[PDB]
Design goal:
319 residues; alpha/beta; Rossmann fold; Rec A Protein, domain 2; three-stranded antiparallel sheet; 13 strands; 24% strand; Protein RecA; DNA repair
């Protein structure tokens, strides 16, 4: 009577119907539920996520050591959302954002809502208020670790209460998540951190998120001796809308955003479109150059090509 696959599907079926789509899923499975998404700004990452970009109306956490490339991504997200004509909110509690660098990645600073909370409750709440107005496409909280409870701030944390922050984070996230889902507003909590300590607030953020990104830096992009930027690596450690654990890499040159041409030269190679002979790159006849960098330039100057690689790559996968 038992037909494991017939019995297994029926099991998964109920499981989703009981806890939500994606509550369980074969890793090879290839999701086909196209959800509204905010493009990460890194094609590779956008594919790693398995749905094009950050899922809308979800809580997204981006953690990693300082300079890992978190903000950048985050900034890009805002940027792509504004192009889709969405409004963006930035609950700043670190005062580091450099609007100028933002404008560079495509952000419309002049139309960006910004708030610099006096307390942690204040911040989270201000956010909650903004979210439930259903007007924002995306909201990004800078530094989970900075949402220090009011009590701790005022200096009354005289060893008379402890752990207050997680709670602050947990309860806050209990409320907002709901509202978020209805508004469709994506919320990116930038968790610049410090296994699994979580800087005091990732405890509750670990369960409320639907997508958790692990941003890390792996190598300094060079030519020969002179540097040009750094290659970041991300690992979607959690994904409740597509098979998790995939990962992508992308280049960010000093002062720039996620290098399109880089992504091109990267996904081109693995995918076959662009061939690499030792220390050289070639694209169906044409020579790109000796070394990823000259190639990058090459693709920067010859707009048509590359634009066509983006094409072929964008075809072999969903564009």
């Amino acid at each position: 009577a038992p037909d494991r696959e017939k019995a297994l599907e029926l099991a998964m079926a109920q499981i989703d119907k009981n806890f939500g789509k994606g509550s369980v899923m074969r890793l090879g499975e290839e999701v086909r539920q196209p959800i509204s998404v905010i493009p990460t700004g890194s094609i590779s990452l956008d594919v790693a996520l398995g749905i094009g970009g950050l899922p809308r109306g979800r809580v997204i956490e981006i953690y990693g050591p300082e300079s890992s490339g978190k903000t950048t991504v985050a900034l890009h997200a805002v940027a792509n959302a504004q192009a889709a004509g969405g409004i963006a909110a930035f609950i700043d509690a670190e005062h580091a954002l450099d609007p100028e660098y933002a404008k560079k990645l495509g952000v419309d600073t002049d139309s960006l809502l910004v708030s610099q909370p006096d307390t942690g409750e204040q911040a989270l709440e201000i956010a909650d208020m903004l979210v439930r107005s259903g007007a924002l496409d995306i909201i990004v909280i800078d530094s989970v670790a900075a949402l220090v409870p009011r009590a701790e701030i005022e200096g009354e944390m005289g060893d008379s209460h402890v752990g207050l922050q997680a709670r602050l984070m947990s309860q806050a996230l209990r409320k907002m998540t709901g509202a978020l889902n209805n508004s469709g507003t994506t919320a990116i909590f930038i968790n610049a951190l410090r296994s699994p300590e979580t800087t005091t607030g990732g405890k509750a953020l670990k369960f409320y998120a639907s997508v958790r990104l692990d941003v890390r830096r792996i190598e300094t992009l060079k030519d020969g001796t002179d540097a040009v930027g750094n290659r970041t690596r991300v690992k979607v450690v959690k994904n409740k809308v597509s098979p998790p654990f995939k990962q992508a890499e992308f280049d960010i040159l000093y002062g720039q955003g996620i290098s399109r041409e880089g992504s091109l030269i990267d996904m081109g190679v693995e995918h076959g479109f662009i061939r690499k002979s030792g220390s050289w790159f070639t694209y169906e006849g044409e020579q790109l150059g000796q070394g990823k960098e000259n190639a990058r330039k090459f693709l920067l100057e010859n707009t048509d090509v590359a634009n066509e690689i983006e094409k072929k790559i964008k075809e072999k996968l969903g564009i």
